[PDB]
């Protein structure tokens, strides 16, 4: 009786067949491509949606009701554990982990001499899985470490987020990067694949996050781990990056201009492509909501006057550590860091170095009618005439998304040295001076601003001398703020440093005068520095997931 | 049964205005009237002579008013319940 | 005459069905069958959703249609409904099990017209109707919109003149300090380019029209002792009330039967050919029309389509959307045929072999014209999409029946073998970069851009061996036993086949000799039945771990395409990128049949010489091992969805059908048919992930287990705050202020949070009833069918944007007219919350505010007709001649608690119009 | 190693309408038939095809455009024509001998 | 009413042609043969590998 067996599935591959040795490269490509195709406008792997809680940027859109859950996150009030955005980001990151685990399981069943690059592919998959786990750990303090590729689907219901403590989870995350650093090639011909230098840098980042211990039920900082700091220094040593051929770009804007994709500073980047055979190309759909109103719609992720004032500098070239926010930045009288004109597009200035599109303080450029200000982010946007920009119901560009930057590596090394305080504060100041000198030289596209709008550029390296630990830490924090503004790491840096509550409360108080959105905003000491574990996930895994402290 | 009866069909265009003895050029894209005068002419006591609006339109300024035109002057033209704002500059 | 005679069988009166004059007979029988819910949106097609005996399974709940012995699940709107002899609804598992293996959700047998023996007849029916829009949603005009915006601004404390929408408000304060608005003025042009003049536009009237319906049927039948035949031609056309939406259908039916060799052999066939061409309304067109403000003109200054500019909300022009969608017409061909052969070797033996065929073809061409409506544009994207779909279902049947009439015992024994095979396929081509931008020019060959190709295919097979035995003693005691062995290709070899028994008992109490003196009691029958039926209506690839090579060529909104293509080299594409595979689902090799057990108890009565007839039914349905698509735990990632037998559903219900027919002394014939039914649904078991995610109810907050299917959990709105003293007295909550919604503290913890939610929604009516009245008097016949539903709650999404300002996705959207009567110090006697520009109180949350009383009673159909007298008919040489005028959905009564309109359709779906019809019937 | 699939679909729809009026006369030995007629014909043809490349399993079950992972092409065309005719016929027979 | 089935396997391998056919004709005479209504319909399905 073949009547009930004649028909077979069409156009699919079964589970028994997907383990064949010829599909391993296909699974590798799938695991890579989840990072460019598995993100939404409201849930992007850059985490700019969840970085609005910081003081760097507001949330754009028509108003507060446009993305009400994200407005609740931004004001740190009225946040519910049953948030669709929280559940979505959890599910998407674990989907990336699942693809990586499937690729790893397929790889583990192959012969070494038959597949010479088996170890390299395994290292790349472990790197991707660790990246997803690191992002999950940043968003949620308590996460499930899914690091067993040869694990049956039925056993996933028994997984719990309390199996390992905070330090143990950090060690589990760092193990993947340790393996990736051990097994990856020094140089990769394909820019998409991570290199040994990228693995080492991201391992250093993991160890730096591990150093700031958060033992105890609450989210309070408990101390600094000297062993973790030494590991950070060891893995951020400049010899590794010299072998990998990575270094600071001659100009700041080269990192975000499409013409200089996969540059020296691009340690690792999600590769976005245009007209590559798909419906609209592997465009950065996560940044689709951030395009200015001049393109037609969206207009999210607006920078903040606090960030502009932070970019404002003094007459000696140093950031104003105490009086930067007293008055709004004045273009004609105040010295300004040149990085501001690459990060934030102020009104009256060309949009993405285009003279034909001058940002104006009208409604044609702000969707919210001045509720969220008029500043426009420029790092994730491109020129309207780039030809790398496409309209697929959301204006999206083929610009690569850099995850690890050599500037980040240098600032991380400086942080490790400063927190060690073993006599290498001078070396940390040297690294900060290197970054500042790069910023000073980065004026290739805004040189005419001096004679066109009266813009005064004045930034100078710090003097090389003995510095106290607190002074060095403050200088480093300011350097990080002015370097990685609008790049979706300010809130995570604040949480890691432990000053997030005070900084956010001060920002709310300061900005409530010029913005009515922060009228009822308030940050809780031990609750709002980490996203709550989704209530749907907790209910699904009954008696296994514990909610974060304060929720 | 649905219309609100606001009488929005009126027109608020400005054809041309004459200050003393100097006609003005009107640009509708930016709602700007520009009146050219001699360099030595005194514009602190200008007199409005004529203002040809649309049918049924009413302007803020009246014919025969004495105005100081040292700075741009805002004008509102109202027809029924619609209005348009122009700016007059004497250069 | 009931086919089963011992189960839950409802006989539908086809004359009253055709009196309503609907394209879909299923939609026509909307409320004429107890325990059978028909929901119809009102689109030009007769497409409707049928639920028999409530919700009985978590997967597909559609009933099984059997037309001339051919089982099918496709809708009847695409067939001809004016050639039906009888309709029988089998709602009992025991009674309907023998008609197919897909009888879990009820079966509808439709017997088409056949040539009556010894006569030839013809019938021509014509009908022309006008459909008018009745539920015109009231939205703010220009002045009302400006007034509402000013009220919101002054309530929030901001300066209304800062609205930056061209509104200038002259306003002041009264003695008490409450703001008042003396007047308003508007800028002529919404933009600085003077291209979009301000206007008062009725968008609903602009996008709606007066639709026209025309129906022409011509049937002709001829019978004889050696055979019979029937031939029908039908045409239907319906222009929807929404512009540029329509549906037309041609139909041709040919039936015949031939008797040979002293009636030993019989060969019959029933074939029908249908061609339906339809243009459908775009999704959320009513929503867009409600959202777009009335200040936007339909046409710009230069004659192009008007659109939002400046600060106006980003909503597309509904008229332009309809104009661009008018070309998206699809053609659908249906070939529904059957051929059977019957052989009678001797008196009691019958062998029937039946072959059925159902071939469906669908051809569509979708166009994407470039549009630029103010700031709304698609960057000049021109594209075409040519799609083709094929469905081919064929059934083979073999039935052997024997009948015995020994003594007073009547015994029927039937055995049967049935095979079903369905194969579906579809493929589409997509082209871009066109120049002329007209339907004639837009073809994939003429395209000059990126091309895409899509295509898929699937199918399944069913095998069934069934047996039935009927025993009747003294024509007083009836017993029925049936057994079914069913297997499907959707299960593994180990769990392929399943066995379902069913038993039915019946007792004609009126035949007993101990009540022969009860002359008034004409007939009384008590019947019971316990049956089991099988369900397998799941995805074809359910037991397989699916890995698909999703390159990413499918359009996706928001960019979550989950495609598999990465520029691993890092060259911004420029060619065919490397691809791979992604997991769609996890296979499960232990999936088996869902088992539905139904227990039915019925009492049929007939009194006063068949003048007062009726039936009372009580049923209990229990579905176990329900095949449900449980999602992943959450850390399992993509493809974690899998089919499992971990469900349990219960349905207790009562039904009561009544009818009274009698004459009158002066010559009035009145026929009354009453109907009332009720049921209760409950979920008993559910997978943990399903209960957590709340797909079947609970909104993901509380498990739906132990509650009705689709029940929702939300807050409780205890009025609104009227003073700062009230705000302070109430328990603390975020965003509480004067004029805001007050939420009850369920657990009395002193703070409003997630835990302050309870069960607030129950989509189960208290009871649904219907009444049909037929009055005949001096060649005048008046038919009047009312349908009512009582005790049903509905979640009103229209209230979300008709009772609140700035509670939508984006601000400054158009709202309902009743928004004007919001609470204020000047307007204290009100319950609508005060207007505000920010949703600080988070009033978008699910709460009792959006739950309304959906109870209603509407006159479904009224029809007055005049029949030409027989003597004039014979003088003019034609048979029965009739004219009629009818109204459909003319009148309705709704509860005062329903703030909206049309309780049957309280959402943004397609509106239900009022139909005024004039028709004639000629018999020649 | 070129792997590709080509899914093609074609439709032909021809419909004809006819109207014939005929009269016959049998006067004397003369037989006379007179027929007039009007005919309308309409033919509409269309076709479209999708083409996909870069398949892996290389079996008819797997080879579908969705399962393809390569360059895609789309073709499509349509045409038609219409005919109108007015015809008349007259037959005369004398003595059943001359036609 | 007619039902027909035809199948032909060509002499060249992997080439074949099969055809199903169903024809229904009828004519009806009404009103003392004054009116006549007739129909001739046929449904064919041919599957071929060339
Ligand atoms: O919260 C409600 C439900 O959504 C859930 C589902 O689980 O999750 C949210 C879910 O929704 C997504 C969509 O992919 O994001 C929505 C989310 O994104 C926000 C910013 O946070 O705004 C996005 C921006 O997009 C715009 C348009 O540019 O708004 C999109 C808006 O409009 C829609 C349909 O809207 C309606 C509903 O039928 O139809 C008409 C036309 O819009 C409106 O009147 C109705 O509101 O589509 C836009 C139209 O464009 C088309 O392509 C053709 O014209 C069609 O797709 C639509 O007709 C929807 O896409 C959406 O509602 C812009 O206004 C916004 O700024 C935020 O505003 C919004 O909430 C996804 O990311 C996320 O996963 C659950 O939370 C819950 O059940
Ligand atoms: O994506 C699903 C979503 O979109 C809609 C309409 O936009 O459906 C589109 C797809 O539905 C398909 C697949 O079944 O058919 C439905 C349409 O085709 C019609 C033609 O008469 O119905 C055919 C057949 O399908 C049913 O509706 C389901 O069994 C039957 O009732 C009917 O007999 C037409 O009625 C439907 O519109 C496919 O053709 C479309 O691509 C929505 O329906 C759905 O929500
Ligand atoms: Mg790129
Ligand atoms: Mg409470």
Numbering used by the authors:
A (entry chain B): 2 to 552
B (entry chain G): 4 to 94
C (entry chain A): 93 to 1016
D (entry chain I): 472 to 570
E (entry chain I): 323 to 372
Quoted from the paper:
Glycan uptake across the bacterial outer membrane (OM) of these bacteria is mediated by SusCD protein complexes, comprising a membrane-embedded barrel and a lipoprotein lid, that is thought to open and close to facilitate substrate binding and transport. Here we show that for both the levan and dextran utilisation systems of Bacteroides thetaiotaomicron, the additional OM components assemble on the core SusCD transporter, forming stable glycan utilising machines which we term ‘utilisomes’. Transport-competent FOS are generated from levan by a surface-exposed lipoprotein, a GH32-family levan endo-glycanase (GHlev), while an SGBP (SGBPlev) is thought to recruit levan at the cell surface. Single particle cryogenic electron microscopy (cryoEM) structures in the absence and presence of substrate reveal concerted conformational changes that demonstrate the mechanism of substrate capture, and rationalise the role of each component in the utilisome.
We reasoned that in a utilisome containing a catalytically inactive GHlev (with the active site D42A mutation), and longer FOS chains (~DP 15-25), the binding of a single levan chain by both GHlev and SGBPlev might reduce conformational variability. We therefore collected such a "long-FOS" cryoEM dataset, and observed in 3D classification that a novel conformation was present, in which the C-terminal domain of SGBPlev adopted a ‘docked’ state proximal to both SusDlev and GHlev (ED Fig. 3c.). The unmasked versions of those 29k particles were then used to generate a final reconstruction of the complete utilisome at 3.0 Å with well-resolved density for a complete SGBPlev. SGBPlev is organised into three domains, as predicted by Alphafold. In addition, density is present at two additional sites that are unique to this long FOS structure. Within the inactivated GHlev active site, there is density for ~five β2,6-linked fructose units, and we define this site as FOS3. A secondary or ‘tethering’ site of FOS binding is also observed (FOS4) with density for FOS bridging between SGBPlev and GHlev. The long, bridging levan molecule binds to GHlev across the top of the GHlev β-propeller domain, before proceeding towards its C-terminal β-sandwich domain. Whilst the resolution is in the region of the bridging levan is insufficient for a detailed description of binding such as hydrogen bonds (3.5-4.0 Å), several tryptophan residues are clearly involved, including W297 and W359 from SGBPlev, and W217 from GHlev, which appear to cradle the levan chain via stacking interactions. The utilisome structure suggests why SusCD transporters exist as dimers. The SGBPlev is clearly inherently flexible, and in the dataset with inactive GHlev and long FOS, a novel conformation was observed in which an untethered SGBPlev from one SusClev contacts the tethered SGBPlev associated with the other SusClev (ED Fig. 4e).
